[PDB]
Amino acid sequence: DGVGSSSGNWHCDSQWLGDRVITTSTRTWALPTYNNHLYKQISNSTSGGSSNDNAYFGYSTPWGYFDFNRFHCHFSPRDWQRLINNNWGFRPKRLNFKLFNIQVKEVTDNNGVKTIANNLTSTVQVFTDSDYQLPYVLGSAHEGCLPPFPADVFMIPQYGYLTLNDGSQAVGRSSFYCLEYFPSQMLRTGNNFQFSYEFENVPFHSSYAHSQSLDRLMNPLIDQYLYYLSKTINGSGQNQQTLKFSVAGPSNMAVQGRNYIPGPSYRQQRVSTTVTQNNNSEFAWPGASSWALNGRNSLMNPGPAMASHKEGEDRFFPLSGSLIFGKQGTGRDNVDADKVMITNEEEIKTTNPVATESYGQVATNHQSAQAQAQTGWVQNQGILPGMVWQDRDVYLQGPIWAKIPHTDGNFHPSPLMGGFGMKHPPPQILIKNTPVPADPPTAFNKDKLNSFITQYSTGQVSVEIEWELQKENSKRWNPEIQYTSNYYKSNNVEFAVNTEGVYSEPRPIGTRYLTRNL
Amino acid sequence: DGVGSSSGNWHCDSQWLGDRVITTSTRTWALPTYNNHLYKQISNSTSGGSSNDNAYFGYSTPWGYFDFNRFHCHFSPRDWQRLINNNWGFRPKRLNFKLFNIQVKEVTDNNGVKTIANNLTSTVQVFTDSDYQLPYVLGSAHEGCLPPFPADVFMIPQYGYLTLNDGSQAVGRSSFYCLEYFPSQMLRTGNNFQFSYEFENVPFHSSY
Amino acid sequence: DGVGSSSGNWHCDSQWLGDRVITTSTRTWALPTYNNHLYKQISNSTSGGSSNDNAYFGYSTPWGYFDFNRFHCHFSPRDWQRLINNNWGFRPKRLNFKLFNIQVKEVTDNNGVKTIANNLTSTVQVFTDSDYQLPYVLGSAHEGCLPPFPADVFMIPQYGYLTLNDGSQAVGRSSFYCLEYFPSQMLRTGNNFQFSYEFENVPFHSSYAHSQSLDRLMNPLIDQYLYYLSKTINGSGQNQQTLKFSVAGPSNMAVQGRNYIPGPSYRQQRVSTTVTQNNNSEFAWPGASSWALNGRNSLMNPGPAMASHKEGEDRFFPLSGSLIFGKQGTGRDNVDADKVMITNEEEIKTTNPVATESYGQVATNHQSAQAQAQTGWVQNQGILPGMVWQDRDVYLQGPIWAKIPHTDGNFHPSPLMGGFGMKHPPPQILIKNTPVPADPPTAFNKDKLNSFITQYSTGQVSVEIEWELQKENSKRWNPEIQYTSNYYKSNNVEFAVNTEGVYSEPRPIGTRYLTRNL
Amino acid sequence: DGVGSSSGNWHCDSQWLGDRVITTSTRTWALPTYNNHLYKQISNSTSGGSSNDNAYFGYSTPWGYFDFNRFHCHFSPRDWQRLINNNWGFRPKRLNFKLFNIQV
Q1: C36 neighbors C47 (Cβ within 8 angstroms)
Q2: Alpha carbon of C28 to those of C193, C426, C459: distances in Å?
Q3: Using a CB-CB distance cutoff of 8 angstroms, which residues of chain B are in contact with residue A453?
Q4: Interface of A with B in 440-459 (CB under 8 A)
Q5: Which residues of chain A does B149 touch, with a Cβ-Cβ cutoff of 8 Å?
Q6: How close D51 comes to chain C (CA, Å)?
Q7: B148 vs chain D: nearest CA distance in angstroms?
Q8: Is the CB of D32 less than 8 angstroms away from the CB of C441?
Q9: Nearest CA of chain B to the CA of D17: how many Å?
């Protein structure tokens, strides 16, 4: 309508229906003017770089975009607690999104002084990519999420997209997407933007951690009917040889036959949190587990979902397996371990192998009267038939979805970092304030106008997700293990604002506190 | 309507139907104030010139005009490639044109400093020549086309028109067109201007 | 149906309705097997050649085609006479075409002896090009027309098509058309093939030769009202100068003003039929009029329609202007003039300039008291506004139509050789007997079969054209000039078969014997 | 019907509809007589062979068969070019097959 009347009402709540959670999250935002309204190429040769591994070629755009894919945007910790206590699984269904109360402002620097005066004529243009024709940048869990605590006011991240490269030089396939093609609603003060979305069917993310390990599914009372080869040697001395078979039973359980086998494993170097126990050598880059592509050596950061510490040893975690988050106010580089929250997967320990430990032991050479049996270790094991694995736990800070790259084939496309892999995620939402030129010269000139009015805009965003649920049916007798707040007097409340206003999150929150049978 | 609501949505795309190409191209623009709102005569005797061959007499006007007649305005090279690979000939049919989101601004120089403050009262007037009563300046492929790459912001070319001459002096047939006669929609912030067109039948340009 | 019953009745007649001529012409034919069922490239480097001018690159195909575009196919001379006596103009309308009574035969050479035995299983495949996707070879008036005299049995010409070239080497645009793509009715003995056609509207070809010259349209009795400059010099001696204007009138007629001007001219060298009058030098190639393209020097064979001999001089004709035909039994190379029928255009002498003579005289330098007037000759003159020309006469032997090459633009596309230029001629009709392999080897082999049964086919063709007419309305009082047969006792009848059976045509036949006003 | 009339018309073309390609390919063929109308066994011991890796046992039949599964059968290169320039993906749907004009 007009400048006077408001475009939309601030609405932020999480309401709990019988089996669904409608979480609105509405936070105010500010969009600067990037690159002076230019497109540029970002190839490392612009700024330094020594390596082939980090060689990258890509374009930077003025457009900003909204990255909300983290959870902490949509769930107040108390409500999160309410989710992961009472529910085995949850899935999104719909996504509603609203921009409103856009207001544009204009900075004027005269001499050593700035003056911010509202601009009613200016516009701000927004569009969503429905058909995924653009690159998808939201998958890597970049910084710039909606702030956890709505009282904050955040900057919108700039948007740029990498393409093919050789060294710092671009191959003829290198795409250039001018973000301008797509029809983009021009918004002025007093216009709101909204759209709806339907998440495609995704398997419910399991929040239940298994209540009985895979290696023991058996019945401790009753024998099987099978015979493992128990004793080859009939006794000490020469030419003592026999085949003695014996029932696999509760006496020796590890040898029984089992219908299934644990999930795949890809080795990770073991790093102890204690200082003195690790080796006194630089092993971070050289010893790490890295998958190589096209001559690029890329870390195998967060790979197959696999447990980290063997029971009773919490001192060490894998070098590059576990997802690591920073505490509030964590420095940028060379941060000590104390200031950093290292995640830990104990919940998956039952059905998946240890990251730091081998997947098993396989024989190599045919035994013979002359030649002894020899068994080599298995460092990596792909999928086998009848193998069972479980996907990585999905943390409150960690991302929600990621786009499954459109390709001939893929296997079990659950993103390694976590969450719900999809063929058609919720679209990107891109916003740029339209450039307004400073006064041109009167005499005509060929060149484009490089002189613009320093400008930025401000508004709200409303991201309303409807989470489907699955409710706990279990008959478990004994009281559950659950999630609590440490009760001993603490100087500050966890998950609550500090004295000077800095909001902070004390520790990561795993998804799986419930137990369930295999 | 009013200052708050937007006049029109940015729409730039090229969509390919069975046998047609609808190419929208939408780029932002800036129009200065030419000649301090005056008409003048441009005859070479104003500025130098040594020759009879270059002798020219004509008027300069404040009015700006949109010269889009180049192709690179309407076709993204990748889409152009798609055109001239798969097709022997192509012809225009319709032309739709829209101005929107006009906003006027006002420069104030006090001492050694400029201040640009929005002006809500001011107007901007636009008209199209339907009957071709004016000279036609778009034919010579002058500079000032819409920029190839929409992220650019361009200046509108000034409009002036030559007439008969002898040396630097004008013959009695020399026409003077005051561009003001024609009815011209007065636009203020929050008004949009649009019209439609039908290209007359033209032989398909051979791309083969 | 079947082998026994006949496919179609021989029908050859020309019947005259009120204003139309339906001429059926049905002649039997024989199609050999070309290139052993292969495609090949014909580039001059295959066989010799010394020149850039004759450099040609093109493909030869097995397919044969029917070239009927000459007139003598469709008109018995007596009927032709009936046409060009009584009619000012004529145009085709419809074309009906029929193949029938196809019979395939098989040659077997045993030892020094051949045996021709009918083959009932074999096929012969025919198709027409409706969409003109192939090259159009019928335009150049190639030999291989249906014979004039239906008792003859003729061979079908082979089909091959030139493309772009540089020297003997092909440029990347060089097209290769496998004639096989197009759907082609497979015919076996006892199948007939037929289709219909509609000629697009073409201007009536004028058979009338004008009864009053262009230079004199005036009224010999009455003056005009104009003044040409009659006398510049007031008399002998110095400083005698005046401007004396006088009416242009019957006294001096050549100076009157005229609304129109004769058609364009492109000079042709004059060659006298008498031996001794021509120069004693080789001038055939060097002195000829040739338009050059892409460095090729191409003769300007049959160019703009322009008269040949100035009245009262029949001794010489242009070097490469006039269409020249050979008498029956004319040798291939270095034939003397007597054995060759040289065409002559006297009918167009009124409205078009002489080929051997300049188009006019134009001044060059500004006259002055000091400098005399000077006038250079005009060798070539393009079209000017208000210019009138008339197209070349269309001989009984000469072609009917030619395809106007599909292009951005063309001007008055009446083919220089003659007849009716069209955007969509009557389509080409291509016929090839399908290859039948000789027995293969039993053991499998990769290569294609190169061993085929020598084979050929035979049948009839029926080309039924409907010619529209325009009838003579003239009020001329005196008896017309007309076409006759020389009555003095001749050893053989003209246009009739010789003693040993050789059919012959004594002299060309022009189209225009009628007179009409401008 | 009978010997005289033809069984079917040679039809070879590739026509491009809005989103489909109907490619007819029609080529003449010749079928010899294999194995003098016998079945035989082809085991390597028939003809030489030194190896366990190449050991093979199988039957040879008189029957011939049509192997068209290659692409170059169904696409004229110019038409192939037209396919892989303008299109991300393509899939077959129907297959029609015709023998005609058999002559022994």
Answers
A1: no
A2: 15, 21, 6
A3: 116
A4: 440-442, 444-446, 448-449, 452-453
A5: 39, 178
A6: 25
A7: 24
A8: yes
A9: 10
> What part of B 98-127 touches A (C-beta under 8 Å)?
100-101, 103-105, 107, 113-118, 120
SS3 C470: strand
d(CA A29, CA A154) in angstroms, rounded, equals: 5
Q: Which domains does chain C have, with CATH numbers?
A: 1-518 (2.170.30.10)
- B–D CB contacts, 8 A cutoff, strictly below: 7
A366-389 burial by CB neighbour count: b if 16+ within 10 A, else e? eeeeeeeeeeeeeeebeeeeeeeb
Instruction: Provide, as residue numbers in chain C, all residues whose Cβ is less than 8 Å from the Cβ of B203.
Output: 408
C191 touches chain D (CB under 8 A): yes
- Residue B150 CA to residue B14 CA, distance in Å, equals 14
Which residues lie across from C205 on neighbouring strands?
Answer: C90
CA distance A67 to A146: 7
Whether the CB of C435 is below 8 Å from some CB of chain D: the reply is yes
How far from A25 is each of A467, B65, C367, CA to CA, in Å?
13, 48, 95
Q: Is C285 annotated as a binding residue?
A: yes
Resolution (A): 2.8
Place of tokens 């022997």: B88
Is the distance from CB of C139 to CB of C403 less than 8 angstroms?
A: yes
Amino acid at A243: L
Residue A71 to residues A76, A94, A422, A467, A509, Cα–Cα distance (Å): 9, 15, 16, 12, 11
Distance CA A197, CA A420 (A): 16
Q: Is D41 exposed, middle or buried (CB count within 10 Å of its CB: 0-12, 13-18, 19+)? A: exposed
The residue type of A420 is: F
**Which residue, among A431, A487, A385, has the nearest Cα to A33 in the 3D structure?**
A431
Residue A401: name the closest of A423, A371, A380, A432 by CA.
Answer: A423
Structure token digits, residue C63: 């397919």
Distance from CA of A128 to the nearest CA of B (A): 13
Binding residues of A for beta-D-galactose: 252, 285
Residue given tokens 């293990």 in the structure block: A481
DSSP 8-class letter at C83: H
Question: Residue C278, Cα to own-chain centre: how many angstroms?
Answer: 28
C-alpha C177/C-alpha C131 separation (Å) is: 14
Q: Which residues of C106-127 are buried (b: 16+ CB within 10 A; e: fewer)?
A: beeeeeeeeeeeebeebbbbbb
Q: DSSP for A370-398, please give it.
A: SSPP-EEEESEE---TTEE--PPP--SSS
Strand ranges (E), A19-109: 20-31, 40-41, 57-65, 87-109
- What H or E segment, with its residue span, contains residue C376? strand C375-378
Establish whether chain A is in contact with chain B, requiring a minimum of 3 CB pairs below 8 angstroms.
yes
DSSP-derived secondary structure for C310-369: -TT--SEEESSSS-EEEPTT--SSS--GGGEEE----TTTTTS-BTTS-SEEEE-SPP-S
Of the candidates D18, D82, D86, which has its C-beta nearest B18's C-beta?
D18
Strand partners, C360: C378
B residues 155-184 closer than 8 Å to D (CB): none
By DSSP bridging, strand C87-109 and strand C114-118 are: antiparallel
Interface test with B, best of D16, D81, D85 (most B CBs within 10 A): D85
The answer to whether the CB atoms of B151 and A180 lie below 8 A apart is yes
Tokens for C133, please give them: 């996707």
- Residue C463 bridge partners (DSSP): C25, C97
